Design a protein around this ligand. Structure first.
Ligand SMILES: CCCCCCCCCCCCC/C=C\[C@H](O)[C@H](N)CO
Ligand SMILES: CCCCCCCCCCCCC/C=C\[C@H](O)[C@H](N)CO
Ligand SMILES: *C(=O)CCCCCCCCCCCCC
Ligand SMILES: *C(=O)CCCCCCCCCCCCC
Lengths: 268, 283, 60, 56, 5, 283, 60, 136, 268, 5
């Protein structure tokens, strides 16, 4: 635009929160569908829904992780990563049912002299593979759900050989996208790439996706966020560079049904 | 209104170019694929395109019966340490690999299911003897109905369960079933658990398998030889073929790249090297 | 109740048609019509918020 | 499949000039490549793949 | 009676 | 608008002639055949001609199923030095001679192919025993799909390849296939190679058979007995009949005059004397 | 969707007709109609550039 | 008669010198170093069909008392709109003495035969570097 | 443009070839005349011309040369530099007569920390001076026509003193533009400058120029391309920097007359 | 419905 508007410079405002960026690579709307509230013709639970609106549909920043030459990748699940985030988390644990869309904003700046590229993927039903070759489908609820800290990918599959006290955790191998399919094909999922010379962030607007209009947020994650180094971090001639990666995520058009007493999960 | 059997777009003739229009240059970071066609980067002639994508419509891609299981039954005398063998199979497409991999190009699906049954029998013992033509009963028992415990017990009465009585040597049996899911679509992947572990509850009590939803998702097929036994032993097998008709699919996925290892997405050590050696600058 | 549709004829020896009658009350019993629609790949190939013009800079 | 009669030819990449960097900059880097079909692309004669099997 | 497609 | 079953032209009456018109004289050097009819060289009467060329239309000339192969399978116990026999056949019309010679009156053709399968079985050993009715699986595996290595391996699942499960003693099996060529017509003759030998390459590396195009032109049919084995051995044969329906042909050729010798036009020494002795002035 | 055509009757005991309905979507599944055309042999019998008049000298 | 479809690219493609027919089939008995060439027998049109029937192909006859040339205008013919000219020949030109040369009472007459050919409406696709074939 | 179109970012497509640039300084059309085929009113040979079109009017890349602190300059002649380029070269050697225009694209990238400036000149009838003060107009055909390797300029005139076996080559002195006129005035010829801080390429569209409608391409060069360092290469504090220069040239609207057997020149 | 030839 001759008034200066740019593909690269954006402002997102949800609730009492605003994100600015000056080095964006446009932004993605997954499957071309913007988030929406549940329509009457698709509705299923009959009780009046709660719609917390600005109290929950706002940007929550998770703990910042660190990208280094040895990093194999990171993953998070939604809504799990937001289970402890203000009134969104509260609404989630107080209700049997809940649905939500999200704006995901991944942040990672560096310099004109650094290089590297992060693949940022939003995967519907991101089922990951377990650490076991003695029992399949054995990852425990506690290990499947890290909350905001997320998990990581590994370059090596290593089977849990403790049969007495199994680890019961995932063992997500990076080139196999943590799920037995090739990473080079993850681009069929809604994605952006943070290539440090080009941009310093990724923005993905995710609709609620499921085979149901609404479901148990506590039992089921709708989306997975997978961040993998497609091209490794590098800087000048330093052997041990580091740059931070920050995740900020906002729920959108979230509504809840089936109010009762609060859920108190076994998370450890 | 564009149909699957319509011809694809014609190539339009294009000549030399020298401008500020830059189709070839792009930025994959955006998450988009550059929509180019040959006339954007080379000189083209006019071609009237007749080819179509008719055979790769979702319906056409799936319009085939695939074997999902082999059930074994026999017609032997039940004796104190061993009974006449009837078969019980939990309905699924995950016991075999080929249809499973095709459905798993997608996250969710809706379809009407066509099941076709191929039935073959043979003698197992040496003796001369004979058997007369067998009739088979394929009974569907849905989650909650009494599963048969003996080849001849009351459950084979089927007052409400659907059964097929198939006569050996006649055309393979076939039935259709509608979209029977308890959700708006079948989930090929469920990133969740069927139970929330509560703190106030024992770990055992809150536990459940990762990625599993209803323990008896679709029920069972129970198959038996209806005939009484012969002096001679005859073993039979029922091969089940599944075809998804009237199908819709959502959310594409990368296909399975390493061997299947159970009903989930798990993989086995030693099978994780799909790709083969090939040098970067070797054609 | 007969449905008459046209065949797309490949090798040749007017429009040739074929006939179909549904014999059952349940639509699940029907054969597949194979009369399917196509859609544009955009939701997967161009899921970006701002419409892409291919001759223009993707980043401006 | 690999077939001489229906062979497609050769894709290759070359340096036209060279990669140039200033001081204080990495002298080596990666490029990534992607492939996709154009709107005139089609397939036919459905078949099983060799890319999955089930031994025993 | 008849439908034509 | 002249159809194949229309009556041929009437003979028109013609009387004596004495003129400069010379129909009888001609010059075959031109490459043309003299278009004469009886009234050009003799006196004729008027005849209303009723005969037609209906049976020699290209369609009618080819409207017959011809045997193109015999496949052998068995249903024997697989044992360490020998497995149960399943059959694999490269689809072609050149393993037999009769349909081949008819198609080769022409250089190119287009047709829809009808395949009919006749299946016969017998006991091979002396013993009394029995076998129960066999079911056969005829699987089409197109170039690139996994060819079966064992009668019972994963490829017989057929999620995408078309298979026919045929029941012994029922009507011969039959399917149709469209014109499936990767060219605009089938080439009965290809005067070329599938590879150019380059100078910068070894001779071995540039080599290819004369007249051969795609190494696996149309794929294979793999046939098996689906039943498990009996104590008694049963051998079966599947005879395949091919009929070209909806056919078009181009560029006529002299028919094969000496015995076929391989898939190409090659001939064998000692077979090159089709014609027999007959004296020039002997009727 | 029925196609009604006439038979050419050989031995006799009006026009006698027969009926045909295509049961399948693919034209490849159809029977052969045998309703074929004839053409003149000229492309093979008289492929010469200058039209031949049979009463005239072929060489002039 | 030990290997069918074995004529090498080099022997199948003589370039402008062409090849010749023979009145006799003679099988290559060198199995160590096979000749890998054609052995086209004249009355069998070099291809196992009778020469007397070759007139169903587009032809002319040079009968010396009548004419001193043959002219054939050939369209592009193939089962494809376009193809590899280097891998595939579309047309073959076969010249055979239907009636043998004879002159006065000379025992050893000779007259020359010259071939002049012009390409027509030729077009090419898929430009790259030049093909350098192994022709010997 | 508010859609982003830039003077600096161009794409050129001729035949099966495309050039992209992101740091152009616009492009030049020599004398404001775009290349054209020969008009009937200006035609001279009467035989049907051949016009190979895409087979010859496409981008051919010549051998890459190297720019250093000691470089005095480079030169090429057209059509000579393209005499061995695919079907263009073939058409040239098979015909007595030929005419052609050209798109010349000179390529040279470096970095924001390098500096230097190349003058890129297209000269009609670029007659260069010889190495001799014993015989004038003595440069041999072989030395006048280097083909794609081109020649170079020198800062020093040095007369060939071998009278027995004269070198018979050019001795083109840089400040005298290799032809006895001052280099500072070469800007009256169609030109661009590759100044490394500003741009990484030069693009010159050259019409066919001659005192005839068509001529012998084998005997006569219509255009000369002269590339000289107006400001020397420099980088950081390195004493011996190097950056490559690549020439890619495409014939345009070329037509040929007088077909015979192929010319086989004595080039060595 | 019907076609007549
Ligand atoms: C007389 C025989 C009747 C047989 C009736 C079978 C009815 C049950 C059909 C179940 C449908 C199974 C569909 C496939 C599997 C699921 O889609 C996946 N696990 C995803 O949810
Ligand atoms: C379930 C059985 C399906 C069988 C499907 C067979 C499909 C393949 C048909 C191939 C068509 C072969 C036509 C004949 C041969 C070629 O025309 C000649 N070599 C010329 O190219
Ligand atoms: C619409 O169907 C009216 C025309 C009826 C045509 C003949 C029907 C042929 C037999 C139909 C049997 C229906 C099966 C229950
Ligand atoms: C046109 O076909 C309308 C008349 C229908 C006449 C009766 C059809 C008889 C049964 C047809 C079955 C079609 C096979 C899929």
């Amino acid at each position: 635009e001759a008034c200066g508007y740019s593909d690269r410079v954006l402002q997102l405002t949800l609730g009492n929160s605003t994100i600015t960026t000056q080095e964006a690579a446009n932004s993605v709307v997954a499957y071309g569908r913007w988030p929406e509230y549940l329509r009457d013709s698709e509705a299923n639970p009959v009780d009046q829904p709660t719609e917390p609106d600005v109290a929950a549909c706002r940007f929550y920043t998770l703990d910042t992780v660190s990208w280094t030459k040895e990093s194999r990748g990171w993953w998070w699940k939604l809504p799990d990563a937001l289970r402890d985030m203000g009134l969104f988390g509260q609404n989630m644990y107080y209700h049997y049912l809940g649905r939500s869309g999200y704006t995901v904003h991944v942040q990672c700046n560096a310099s004109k002299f650094h290089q590297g590229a992060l693949g940022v993927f939003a995967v519907p039903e991101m089922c990951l593979a377990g650490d076991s070759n003695t029992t399949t489908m054995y990852t425990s609820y506690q290990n499947a759900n890290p909350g905001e800290k997320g998990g990581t990918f590994t370059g090596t599959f290593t089977p849990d050989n403790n049969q007495t006290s199994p680890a019961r955790r995932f063992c997500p191998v990076d080139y196999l996208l943590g799920n037995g399919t090739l990473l080079g094909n993850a681009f069929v999922f809604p994605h952006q790439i943070i290539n440090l010379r080009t941009n310093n962030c990724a923005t993905l607007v995710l609709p609620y996706v499921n085979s149901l209009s609404i479901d148990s947020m506590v039992k089921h994650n709708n989306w997975g966020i997978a961040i993998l180094p497609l091209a490794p971090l590098n800087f000048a001639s330093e052997s041990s560079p580091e740059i931070p990666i920050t995740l900020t995520i906002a729920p959108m058009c979230c509504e809840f049904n089936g109010l009762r007493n609060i859920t108190l999960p076994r998370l450890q | 209104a564009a149909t699957s059997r319509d011809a694809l777009p014609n190539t339009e003739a294009s000549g030399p170019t020298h401008s500020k229009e830059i189709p070839a240059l792009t930025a994959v970071e955006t998450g988009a694929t550059n929509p180019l066609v040959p006339s954007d980067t080379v000189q083209t002639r006019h071609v009237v395109q007749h080819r179509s994508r008719s055979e790769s419509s979702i319906e056409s891609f799936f319009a085939r019966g695939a074997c999902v299981t082999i059930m074994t039954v026999d017609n032997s005398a039940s004796t104190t340490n061993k009974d006449k063998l009837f078969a019980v199979w939990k309905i699924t497409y995950k016991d075999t690999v080929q249809l499973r991999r095709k459905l798993e190009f997608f996250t969710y699906s809706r379809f009407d299911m066509e099941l076709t049954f191929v039935v073959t029998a043979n003698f197992t013992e040496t003796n001369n003897g004979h058997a007369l033509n067998q009739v088979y009963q394929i009974m569907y028992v849905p989650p909650g109905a009494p599963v048969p415990e003996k080849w001849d017990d009351y459950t084979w009465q089927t007052s409400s369960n659907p059964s097929i009585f198939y006569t050996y040597g006649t055309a393979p049996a076939r039935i259709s079933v509608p979209y029977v899911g308890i959700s708006n679509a079948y989930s090929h992947f469920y990133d969740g658990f069927s139970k929330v572990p509560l703190k106030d509850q024992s770990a055992a009590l809150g536990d459940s398998l990762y990625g599993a939803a209803s323990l008896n998702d679709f029920g069972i097929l129970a198959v038996r030889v209806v005939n009484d036994h012969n002096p001679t032993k005859v073993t039979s097998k029922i091969r089940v073929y599944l075809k998804p008709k009237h199908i819709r699919v959502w959310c594409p996925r990368p296909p399975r790249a390493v061997a299947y290892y159970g009903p989930g997405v798990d993989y086995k050590d030693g099978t994780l090297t799909p790709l083969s050696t090939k040098d970067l600058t070797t054609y | 109740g007969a449905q008459v549709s046209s065949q797309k004829v490949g090798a040749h020896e007017s429009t040739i048609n074929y006939t179909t009658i549904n014999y059952y009350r349940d639509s699940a019993s029907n054969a597949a019509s194979k009369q399917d629609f196509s859609q544009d790949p955009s939701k997967f190939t161009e899921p970006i918020k701002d419409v892409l013009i291919k001759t223009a800079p993707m980043l401006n | 499949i690999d077939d001489s009669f229906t062979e497609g030819g050769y894709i290759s990449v070359f340096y036209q000039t060279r990669i140039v960097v200033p001081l204080s900059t990495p002298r080596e880097m990666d490029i990534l490549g992607f492939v996709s079909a154009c709107n005139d692309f089609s397939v036919r004669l459905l078949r099983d793949t060799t890319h999955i099997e089930q031994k025993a | 009676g008849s439908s034509s497609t």
